[PDB]
Design a protein around this ligand. Structure first.
Ligand SMILES: COCCNC(=O)N1CCN(C(=O)c2ccc(C)o2)CC1
Length: 119
């Protein structure tokens, strides 16, 4: 029933993601010299360094907010990909499965802890 526990859980999940080769494309911003049309397709860039920095700045109130930004990384990859069999998109889908597998308990425990606080 620890209402704060999600934050370290998210820090340790981001550490796992940063160790994962599938996160390589999603750590830092997209260079427009390399993808000149990226912002013609993607309105709101997002990457795992920005998620980690937002977390470490104390600028997430809940793991749901972190989960919306992580999911935006994946939806951007799906929107930008020219093919569902692209290398970078294919890395996004595996990383997304890994992230959803690990975040499900973090969200559950947080919401459980809030409910207990409100009881
Ligand atoms: C080493 O990473 C450098 C920073 N990252 C990127 O440059 N990008 C990551 C995001 N992204 C895509 O999701 C995507 C889908 C299909 C294709 C071709 O790219 C565009 C490339």
């Amino acid at each position: 029933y620890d209402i704060q526990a999600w934050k370290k859980q998210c820090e340790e999940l981001l550490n796992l993601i940063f160790q994962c080769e599938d996160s390589e494309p999603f750590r830092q911003p997209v260079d427009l010299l390399e993808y000149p049309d990226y912002r013609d397709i993607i309105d709101t860039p997002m990457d795992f360094a920005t998620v980690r920095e937002t977390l470490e700045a104390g600028n997430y109130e809940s793991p749901m907010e972190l989960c919306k930004d992580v999911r935006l990384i994946f939806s951007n990859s799906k929107a930008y990909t020219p093919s569902k069999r692209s290398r970078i998109y294919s890395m996004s889908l595996r990383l997304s499965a890994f992230f959803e597998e690990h975040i499900s308990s973090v969200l559950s425990d947080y919401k459980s802890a809030l409910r207990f606080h409100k009881r």
